[PDB]
Ligand SMILES: Cc1cc2nc3c(=O)[nH]c(=O)nc-3n(C[C@H](O)[C@H](O)[C@H](O)COP(=O)(O)OP(=O)(O)OC[C@H]3O[C@@H](n4cnc5c(N)ncnc54)[C@H](O)[C@@H]3O)c2cc1C
Ligand SMILES: Cc1cc2nc3c(=O)[nH]c(=O)nc-3n(C[C@H](O)[C@H](O)[C@H](O)COP(=O)(O)OP(=O)(O)OC[C@H]3O[C@@H](n4cnc5c(N)ncnc54)[C@H](O)[C@@H]3O)c2cc1C
Ligand SMILES: N[C@@H](Cc1ccccc1)C(=O)O
C-alpha cells in the first residue's frame with residue numbers, strides 16, 4: 028500500500044482524468060479520502076488515446092475525423108509500448124488488464140535512408156543491415172588487433188579473447204574477413220531436398236559506412252525501449268477504463284472543462300463547465316494535472332514566479348496516422364509480423380500491428396513522427412496527411428502500400444484540444460521544474476512533465492504517487 | 505494450391521503422424537486422394553509435444569512421469585518457437601491456430617559463465633553485458649581509427665562516419681571513452697521529481713573481455729532465431745491437433761506400431777500392431793516419416809544402399825525440464841517477462857514463459873540442453889534431473905529459484921519411445937546419403953525434417969511433406 032488509512036474527513040479535487048489524475052484519485056480513495064475527478068473530454072486517459080470504429084475527434088483547426096476501423100481493430104494514437112521496469116505494468120496487474128508482447132525490434136522490417144551512395148532511398152532489412160555493419164566492424168577491429176595497434180592496452184590473452192568474440196559476432200571467415208552471412212537472410216527460402224535456398228549477398232564496406240544504414244541500431248539499447256516490451260491487449264486505454272471503473276463514475280465528471288482554480292480560505296475552489304452549465308466545487312486540496320502550458324489560461328491566484336515556471340515546459344509536436352488494410356500484405360508478402368520500418372523521410376517510421384496475426388485485415392501506423400517531421404503533417408488536412416503518408420510508405424514497402432486501403436485516422440497532438448502538446452520540453456532538473464514540485468499552498472501539480480520519465484506513463488504514475496504521499500503526510504501533521 | 509485435384513481413385517499410406525506425416529495426409533486429401541495415417545503414439549505431432557496436466561509418458565528406461573500442471577499451464581517439450589520465414593506460420597493461418605509473440609531476446613534475463621575473472625559465475629543482465637561489451641568494443645575501434653591503423657582501408661570521410669556511429673553505438677563520452685551508460689540499467693528506478701534513480705556502474709575493460717559475457721550475443725542474429733519470433737497460443741501441439749481434425753480421426757490409426765514396410769506388386773504393404781492385433785494395409789504409394797534410425801528395425805525389402813544411407817543420419821541428444829512455480833518471481837522480483845537466461849552450466853539456459861503475464865503461477869523451462877550437456881541429464885531419474893536443475897538454476901537466479909515449486913516434468917528425446925533422437929546430424933555434413941534418400945524406392949517415399957535444409961525445424965518437415973506430395977501427384981498425373 029502506498030499510504031495508510033487517513034483519519035477523519037478530507038477531500039481532494041483532481042483536475043484532469045489522464046493517467047496522473049486517475050492514479051491520484053485511485054490511491055487517495057483507497058486510503059479513505061473523498062475524491063472528485065474533473066475531466067474535460069468524454070473519455071478517460073488523456074494522451075493515452077486508442078482509436079477504434081466510432082471514435083470522433085474535432086481538432087483545433089475545426090476538422091472532424093470519424094474513425095471507421097473494423098470491429099476489434101484499433102491503434103494507439105499516443106502511448107503504445109511499455110518496458111519491463113515501469114510501474115505501468117504493476118498497475119496492469121492490480122487492475123486486471125491483460126498485457127501482451129509489443130514488437131519493438133524486428134529483423135524483417137526495413138531501413139531506408141538518403142545518402143551519397145547507391146543505397147540512397149533503397150529498402151534494406153534490419154538483419155541484412157546489421158550483418159553487414161557488424162561484419163565489417165568486427166573485421167576492422169580484428170585487423171587492428173592483429174596488426175598490433177592495441178598492444179599497449181590489450182595483453183596477448185586479451186587479444187585472443189577479443190578475436191574469438193569478433194569472429195563470432197561478425198560471422199567472419201577463418202582468415203578474419205566479412206564475406207557475407209546467412210544472418211543477412213535469403214532471396215529464396217531454404218526448403219527440403221536440394222532446395223538449399225539463396226543467401227542475400229553483402230554490400231561493400233564503403234557502401235555500408237557511407238550510407239549510414241546503422242544509424243538506428245542503438246535504439247534497441249534504450250533503457251526504456253529494449254526488448255522485451257509490452258502493451259495491453261485491445262489498446263492502451265484499457266488501463267484507464269479500468270481505473271475509471273475502480274474509482275466509480277459517480278466520482279468523475281466527464282465533459283467538465285475547468286475554467287478557474289483558486290486557493291481560498293475554505294480550501295481550493297475549482298469552477299468548470301459541464302453540459303453547457305456552470306458548476307463549482309471546493310475541496311481541501313487540489314491536484315492539477317492539466318498540461319502546464321494550459322494552466323495559465325485558467326482564472327487563478329498562482330504567484331507570478333509559478334506562472335513563469337509553467338511557461339518553461341515547452342509544448343512538443345508529435346502525431347500518428349493509422350491505415351486499415353483489408354489484406355495483411357506485410358505478413359503475407361514481406362514476412363513482417365509486428366515491429367517498425369525506420370526512415371529519414373517525414374513519416375519517420377511505419378509500425379506494424381502486434382495483434383490479429385494471420386487475420387484478414389489490420390491497422391498499420393503509417394507514420395509516428397515528432398518535431399520537424401511532424402510539423403510537416405500538423406498543418407495538412409487529414410486527406411493530405413494520408414496522401415503524403417501513402418506516397419512515402421510506397422517508397423519503402425512498394426506499390427502494395429497503396430492498395431487494399433479501407434479507411435484511416437490521424438492525430439496531431441499539438442492540434443488536439445486539451446493536450447496541445449505531445450509532451451513537455453523544459454527550457455534549458457531545471458529551476459522551473461524544481462519550483463513546480465512544491466505545493467502552491469493547497470494546490471499540487473502532477474504529471475509526466477514533473478518526472479524523469481517524460482512521455483512515459485511511468486512518469487505520470489510516479490508523479491501521482493509522490494503527490495498523494497505528500498498530501499497524506501501533510502494531513503498527518 | 506499446392507496441387508489441384510487428382511483424377512480417379514488413388515491411395516497413400518503415411519507412416520507416422522508427426523508434422524511431415526500429417527502435412528502429407530492433409531495435402532493429399534485436399535487433392536482427392538484416399539489417405540491413411542499410422543501413428544504409434546496416441547497423440548498427433550511426434551517431436552512436437554506439449555506437456556500439460558494429465559500427460560503421462562514412460563521413457564525407455566522404464567520410468568513413468570505424470571504431469572500435474574495447473575489447468576491452462578504447459579510447456580513445449582520439443583518445438584516451441586517459429587521465425588517469420590517458416591511455412592509453419594502459413595499453416596497456422598490455414599488451420600486457424602492463433603499465434604502470439606515468443607520472447608527470444610530479453611535485456612533483463614541473465615548471462616552466467618565461468619572465467620578467470622571476478623565475473624566468473626556471476627549473473628549479469630544482457631543489457632549490462634551488452635552495454636559494457638559494445639562500449640569497450642566501440643572505444644577500442646575508435647582508438648584504432650584515430651591512431652591511423654585503418655588509414656589504408658578507410659578514407660577521412662569514412663573514419664568520421666565510423667567514429668560518429670561508434671560514439672552512438674557504444675554510448676561513448678565526448679572524448680571517446682566508455683564510462684558507463686543508462687543502457688546498463690538501474691539499481692534504483694528513475695521516478696518523479698528529484699528521484700533520478702541510480703545507474704548500475706560498468707565493469708572494467710579487461711574483466712569484460714576475459715569474462716566472455718558476450719559469447720552468446722550472436723544468437724540474436726541467427727536467421728531462424730532473430731526477433732520477431734512466434735508460437736501458438738496454448739501449445740505448439742495445437743497445430744497438429746488442428747491437422748488431425750481436418751484430416752479426420754477416421755483416417756488416422758493411433759496406437760499403430762508399424763513393424764513391416766514392403767514394396768509389392770500393387771503398391772506398398774505395411775504391417776502394424778494396433779489393439780493387440782496384427783494388421784495390414786496396402787496402398788498405391790507410401791510416405792515413410794519414421795525417424796531414419798528407426799526405419800532399419802522394420803521388416804522391409806529396401807535395397808542395401810538405401811539401408812546404408814539411412815544409417816548416415818546420426819541421432820542426437822536434447823531435453824527439457826519444466827517447473828511450475830506458484831509465484832511468478834521472475835516477473836515480480838527480477839522484472840523478467842519471457843526470454844531466457846544463458847549459461848555454460850549443463851542446464852544451458854532457463855526459459856521464462858510467454859503467456860499468463862502478471863498472473864499467479866507459471867511454468868519455467870529449467871533447462872533446455874543438447875549434445876554433451878544433455879548427456880548429463882539423460883541417465884538421471886526425473887527426481888535427479890530436477891535436483892540438478894534447481895541447484896544450477898539457483899546459482900544463476902538465487903535462492904528464490906528453490907522456492908514456490910509446485911510440480912515438474914521432463915523429456916529426454918534420445919530416451920523417448922518412437923523418437924530416440926531430437927534430430928539428425930548427417931555424417932560428412934548435401935551428403936551422398938541425404939541425396940540418395942530423396943529418391944523414391946519404387947512406390948516408397950521418405951519424408952521428414954532430416955531430408956531438408958531446416959533440420960530441427962517444423963519448416964523442414966512441412967517442406968519435405970509438400971515436396972514429396974508434389975512428386976507423387978506429378979507421377980500419378982503421368
Ligand atoms: C505520441 C505519444 C506517444 C507516447 N508514447 C508512450 C509510450 O509508448 N508509452 C508510455 O508509457 N507513454 C507514452 N506516451 C506518454 C503518455 O501518454 C503520457 O506520459 C501520459 O498520458 C501522461 O499523463 P498525464 O496525466 O500527466 O497527462 P495527460 O495524459 O495529458 O492528461 C491530462 C488530462 O487533463 C485533461 N484536461 C486538459 N485541460 C483540462 C481542463 N481545462 N479541464 C479538465 N481537464 C482538462 C485532459 O483532457 C487529459 O485527460 C506517449 C504520448 C504521446 C502523445
Ligand atoms: C528438443 C527439440 C526442440 C525443437 N525446437 C524446435 C522449435 O522451437 N521450432 C520448430 O519449428 N521445430 C523445433 N523442433 C523440431 C520439430 O519438432 C521437428 O522438426 C518435427 O517434429 C519433425 O517432424 P517429422 O514428421 O519429420 O518427425 P517426428 O516429429 O519425429 O514424427 C515422426 C512420427 O513417427 C512416429 N513413429 C515412430 N516410429 C513409428 C512406428 N514404428 N510406427 C508408427 N509411427 C511411428 C512417431 O511417433 C512420430 O509421431 C524441435 C524438436 C526437438 C526434439
Ligand atoms: N516514450 C515515447 C516517446 C519517445 C519516442 C522515442 C524515443 C524516446 C521517446 C515513445 O516510446 O514513443
Ligand SMILES: N[C@@H](Cc1ccccc1)C(=O)O
Pocket residue numbers: 585729959960961
Ligand atoms: N530449432 C531448434 C534447435 C536449435 C537450437 C538453437 C539454434 C538452432 C536451432 C530450436 O530452436 O531450439
